[PDB]
UniProtKB/Swiss-Prot annotation:
EC class (word): ligase
UniProt effect for mutating residue 149 to A: Severely impairs activity with THF as substrate, even more so than with DHP. Both substrates show a reduced affinity, but the catalytic rate with THF is 23-fold lower than wild-type, whereas that with DHP is 2.5-fold lower
Gene: folC
Binding positions for Mg(2+) 1 per the UniProt entry: 78, 141
Annotated organism of origin: Escherichia coli (strain K12)
Function, in words: Functions in two distinct reactions of the de novo folate biosynthetic pathway. Catalyzes the addition of a glutamate residue to dihydropteroate (7,8-dihydropteroate or H2Pte) to form dihydrofolate (7,8-dihydrofolate monoglutamate or H2Pte-Glu). Also catalyzes successive additions of L-glutamate to tetrahydrofolate or 10-formyltetrahydrofolate or 5,10-methylenetetrahydrofolate, leading to folylpolyglutamate derivatives.
GO CC annotations on file: cytoplasm
Protein name: Dihydrofolate synthase/folylpolyglutamate synthase
Pathway: Cofactor biosynthesis; tetrahydrofolate biosynthesis; 7,8-dihydrofolate from 2-amino-4-hydroxy-6-hydroxymethyl-7,8-dihydropteridine diphosphate and 4-aminobenzoate: step 2/2; Cofactor biosynthesis; tetrahydrofolylpolyglutamate biosynthesis
Length: 414
């Protein structure tokens, strides 16, 4: 059993093995420990963000605007690209590793004999770190689903649903309706329930009615329009024009703005512009370099692949598209690749080290074309060796693939 003085790495290895099951959805055990720790209300204002895709970037947008508005903001995000500490930001910055291990030590003593999973532990830690930080606003990214996610032990002041599509059917049910119901579990009585999914499953309205939540959805209570050079937003309180084209997915920037406006928080139009203009998240349609155009995107399900495919087709015409890909077997690899195949010319497949990582040959079979490599680094090197300046190299499929290339590039700078 690690202690406050133990390295973070030891703590993470310990958390990875503490509970009988890796993922164990449910609120009881975790709520009881949160109750002992006094971390159930981490800040006077909390945004909780659920959805199939778009959670990370919607949270980043909220963080960016609120910081511009001068609020002390904390953000809980998952999963992480390279380092675990990425999961907890205060004022847009990671916290010291020793703050994390101290928090873990507090949870370890407070839990007594109550067992907690890795994500439950990490959630309690983020909450405790936020409480210590005396923040004005805390933004919680839901881990998985909503209703039974560890983050749902906190009562959000504004609940957000970014999109509803097929992912995590093992836990959330086989269709958009079952998935929508689970995501909507973060809604609360008399609190805004901001829905950015344009094709809202009816179950989301059911849950909003069951809870007495204040549903405000895209296409109804609020909306946005786009141009090649900017965008506009509208809701019950008015309209905003010539907004900065987002550096995060367009739908999420609009969802964040809707949630921000529904919150009643005091935020100027300039803080909104500055926030949107500066909101960006590594690995989310990230333009890394040019000649050739290098793009990183963590899409890992067909809805995200379809969106990515749409962004790829919107890129300047000409040149070849070479993809460096690695994926986990727990995702709909076939459906994800079906979309990507329509835009990719040359495939460079790599295995993902793992209990759940697909091998290069497994990916190759889905493609019907392409080359296999022994590692992401080698696939990346082969693509970049083949790419001409007019081409685009897309690193995709998983957080793992993107992270591997980010690390190879950074290491080469030394
Ligand atoms: N009550 C609990 N909730 C909970 N929620 C999530 C998890 C596992 N951690 C995850 C983190 C991220 C994702 C994910 O898909 O993240 P993105 O969609 O943003 O990419 C899934 C699981 N365990 C428990 C768990 O064990 N208990
Ligand atoms: N509204 C959206 N619709 C479809 N796909 C999206 C949307 N937002 C993001 N994505 C996809 O999901 C990936 C990660 O997005 P992120 O904003 O971190 O959301 P999440 O935390 O839910 O995974 C992106 O790189 C993109 O491939
Ligand atoms: Mg997910
Ligand atoms: Mg996320």
């Amino acid at each position: 059993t690690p202690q406050a003085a133990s390295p973070l790495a030891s703590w993470l290895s310990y958390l990875e093995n503490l509970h009988s099951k890796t993922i164990d959805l449910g609120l009881e055990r975790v709520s009881l420990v949160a109750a002992r720790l006094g971390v159930l209300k981490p800040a006077p204002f909390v945004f909780t963000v659920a959805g199939t895709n778009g959670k990370g970037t919607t949270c980043r947008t909220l963080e960016s605007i609120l910081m511009a508005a001068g609020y002390k903001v904390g953000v809980y995000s998952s999963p992480h690209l390279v380092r675990y500490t990425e999961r907890v930001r205060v004022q847009g910055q990671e916290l010291p590793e020793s703050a994390h291990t101290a928090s873990f030590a507090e949870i370890e003593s407070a839990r007594g004999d109550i067992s907690l999973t890795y994500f439950e532990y990490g959630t309690l830690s983020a909450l405790w770190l936020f409480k210590q930080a005396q923040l004005d606003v805390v933004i919680l990214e839901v881990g998985l689903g909503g209703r039974l996610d560890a983050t749902n032990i906190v009562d959000a002041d504004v609940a957000v649903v970014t999109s509803i599509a097929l992912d995590h059917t093992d836990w959330l049910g086989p269709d958009r309706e079952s998935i929508g119901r689970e995501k909507a579990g973060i809604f609360r009585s008399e609190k805004p329930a901001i829905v950015g999914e344009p094709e809202m499953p009816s179950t989301i309205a059911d849950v909003a009615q069951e809870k007495g939540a204040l549903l405000q959805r895209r296409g109804v209570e609020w909306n946005y329009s786009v141009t090649d050079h900017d965008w506009a937003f509208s809701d019950a309180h008015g309209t905003l024009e010539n907004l900065p084209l987002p550096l995060v997915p367009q739908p999420n920037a609009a969802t964040a703005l809707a949630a921000l406006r529904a919150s009643g928080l005091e935020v100027s139009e300039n803080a909104i512009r500055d926030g949107i203009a500066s909101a960006i998240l590594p690995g989310r349609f990230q333009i890394v370099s040019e000649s050739p155009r290098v793009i990183f995107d963590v899409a890992h399900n067909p809805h995200a692949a379809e969106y990515l495919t749409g962004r790829m087709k919107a890129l300047p015409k000409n040149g070849r598209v070479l993809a460096v890909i690695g994926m986990l077997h727990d995702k709909d690899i076939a459906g994800t690749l079906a979309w990507l195949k329509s835009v990719v010319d040359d495939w460079y497949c790599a295995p993902l080290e793992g209990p759940r990582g697909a091998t290069a040959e497994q990916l190759l079979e889905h493609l019907g074309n392409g080359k296999s490599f022994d590692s992401v680094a080698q696939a990346w090197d082969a693509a970049m060796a083949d790419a001409k300046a007019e081409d685009t190299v897309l690193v995709c499929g998983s957080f793992h693939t993107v992270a591997h290339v980010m690390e190879v590039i950074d290491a080469r700078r030394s």
